[PDB]
Design brief:
The protein is an alpha/beta fold. It contains 14 helices and 14 strands. It is found in: Cytoplasm, P-body.
Length: about 375
């Protein structure tokens, strides 16, 4: 339940806890052990899920302060992401005795060259600039056995992909590569096959499945939504449930209302600090409460096994969002229930999402068969 579990350097744990980090995000929890193993990683990651610390923590663990060489290279497409990355490195690694340098475009090349006169353990930078410094022989990447790409798709388009390959020529032939990307077009997939060794893959499916999820809709007006939900919860045999709303404020308001009715729940939304969201994920997965009200998931689709009922309190506008809410990546035998609260204004999107996803969302029956969503799990 804590970063202490990962058996990390005392000094690294100090920086983690002093930075207000406590419980890892799903991507951090999965990626950290894998990176410590020495595996290559290819990970679909979205923003606001703590992907930066997922690679920075293993980097700080592996890097040896006593060796006066660049041991990790973190590639990023923009200066803004370089600065966000170095902030995490210097915060989490406050007590580690490790030195980080940023090198990007839109800065004085001269100042980066003289900085390299002094010790750099972790180099964070953009393709053009990093290649520039490597080719001039100012940045010595001969011991740089850890290679990281953050937003790999942006740096693996046709006008950047050759630059990345040229940078890899300066690394030791044997290196670990951790790549994180939101999308996986042809050029990205080609690079991965060529330049990763049997990578551990996180969330790479591409299209979530609705198989085993029986989907219904209850026609309601806005004022009925709470009472419809209340009625359903009194009748359904819920293990755990997740309820989606379309705004962070509606998340909070609904959570308050059901709490007042006496339902055990947490809420989680995108305006919360990352670390507060991680806390909810862990305690909800532990089964400390029955219900999670949220605006979205930290994970890609629900992967809490005990959730057998999912409610769209507000119906989404697009098929993409519907699928991300109701679809899943693994456990293909799983059976669950999804109920959509549909007002008059959702009528078009209802038909549109059914069509685009090639799925059925039938009118909710008076009684729902338990075989559709209750197992001996």
């Amino acid at each position: 339940n804590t970063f202490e579990d990962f058996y990390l350097k005392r000094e690294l744990l100090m920086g983690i806890f002093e930075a207000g980090f406590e419980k890892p995000s799903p991507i951090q929890e999965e990626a950290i052990p894998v990176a410590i193993t020495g595996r290559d990683i290819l990970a679909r990651a979205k923003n606001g899920t703590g992907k930066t610390a997922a690679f920075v923590i293993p980097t700080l663990e592996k890097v040896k302060p006593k060796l006066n060489k660049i041991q990790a290279l973190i590639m990023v497409p923009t200066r803004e992401l370089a600065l966000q990355t170095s902030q995490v490195v210097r915060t989490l690694g406050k007590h580690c005795g490790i030195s980080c340098m940023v090198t990007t475009g839109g800065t004085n090349l001269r100042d980066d060259i003289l900085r390299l006169n002094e010790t750099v353990h972790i180099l964070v930078g953009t393709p053009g600039r990093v290649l520039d410094l490597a080719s001039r022989k100012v940045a010595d990447l001969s011991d740089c056995s850890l290679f990281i790409m953050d937003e790999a798709d942006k740096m693996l388009s046709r006008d950047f992909k050759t630059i990345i390959e040229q940078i890899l020529s300066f690394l030791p032939p044997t290196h670990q590569s951790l790549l994180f990307s939101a999308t996986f077009p042809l050029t990205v997939k080609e690079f991965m096959v060529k330049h990763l060794h049997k990578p551990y893959e996180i969330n790479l499916m591409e299209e979530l499945t609705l198989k085993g999820i029986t989907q219904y809709y209850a026609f309601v007006e806005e004022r009925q939504k709470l009472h419809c939900l209340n009625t359903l919860f009194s009748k359904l045999q819920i293990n755990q449930a997740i309820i989606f709303c379309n705004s962070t404020n509606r998340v909070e308001l609904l959570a308050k209302k059901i709490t007042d009715l006496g339902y055990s729940c947490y809420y989680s939304h995108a305006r919360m600090k990352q670390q507060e969201r991680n806390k909810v994920f862990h305690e909800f997965r532990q089964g400390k409460v029955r219900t999670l009200v949220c605006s979205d998931l930290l994970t890609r689709g629900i992967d809490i096994q005990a959730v057998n009922v999912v409610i769209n309190f507000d119906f989404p506008k697009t098929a993409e969002t519907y699928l991300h809410r109701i679809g899943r990546s693994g456990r293909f035998g799983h059976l669950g229930l999804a109920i959509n609260l549909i007002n008059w204004n959702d009528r078009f999107n209802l038909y549109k999402i059914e069509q685009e996803l090639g799925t059925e969302i039938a009118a909710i029956p008076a009684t729902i068969d338990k075989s559709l969503y209750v197992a001996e799990n």
